[PDB]
Amino acid sequence: SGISLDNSYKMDYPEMGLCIIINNKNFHKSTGMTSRSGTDVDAANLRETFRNLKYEVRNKNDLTREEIVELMRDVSKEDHSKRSSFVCVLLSHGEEGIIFGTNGPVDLKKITNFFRGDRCRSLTGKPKLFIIQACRGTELDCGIET
Amino acid sequence: ASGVDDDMACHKIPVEADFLYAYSTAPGYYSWRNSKDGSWFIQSLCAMLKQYADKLEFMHILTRVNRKVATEFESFSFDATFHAKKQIPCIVSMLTKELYFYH
Amino acid sequence: ASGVDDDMACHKIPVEADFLYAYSTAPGYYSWRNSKDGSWFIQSLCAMLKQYADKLEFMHILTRVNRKVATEFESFSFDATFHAKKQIPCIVSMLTKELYFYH
């Protein structure tokens, strides 16, 4: 055939892929973490948005740190051969490099490692997208007038 | 030319390759959320995806998200400490190719 | 609609906005350099800028750099610990617009 350039990911597999949405709104009283009002609006908006992009959306609400890890592990263990990509959206409280389960923290690295090129072979060479809505610290940007 | 670190017989890619992290905010900063309309970042991300997913490459879509959040949002709080604050999303790409949701 | 965090009378932008950090490697990882040809990242960055600066948007140029480093380079060392290693650059963008070096 003619000149072949591979500058863009192959996105015409039978499936676009999974879009896992972890929506943590209510936290265990024991942690004292405040409920994240308005997060349901985000979760719904994301579900519809990615649905229209043809992703297989799976929403999970109020997951403990253990459930977040088990979910990611199980998902990384699936056969993504016929899927073009992978998307995971995390909605919760957080700090730099950390996302909060309803009962404690989860290192983002712990979550993303399951999808490493050598640990999830059916996603090797495919885009793995992690969308994170959470604090990355306590610094405040006062901005500047334009 | 020739070297010890190139033209490998067996091709491999980094295990960290092909990851894209779309952070709602810059490293070390707070991330704002409206208790009624949702987070500034997700609100903006969905809006830009809905309007540009069938037109622009992903990084360019996320750049529009950066601009939307940076220019259109500012916090309001009865607490001076958290009032009049801004936010800039942070795109972290280890992708190796352009990404279009359409084909 | 109307809200307390939008449509500000006085427009401001985040002080962290409009920054782009082109890291040679992923967070927490080593960055490799050939004692004779230079670092893998800079070698690749210059090559892609020379070939695409008058053709592609900056993020797309950096994406080519990511691919070049990720696929074409692998370390060689007499020390097994540092032998056969890979590298993936890390693009961190807080930019709010597309960037073309030409006009």
């Binding site: 604090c135 | 959320r33 409206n34 958290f82 | -």
Partner: peptide, 4 residues
Amino acid sequence: IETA
């Protein structure tokens, strides 16, 4: 506005 919510965010700490």
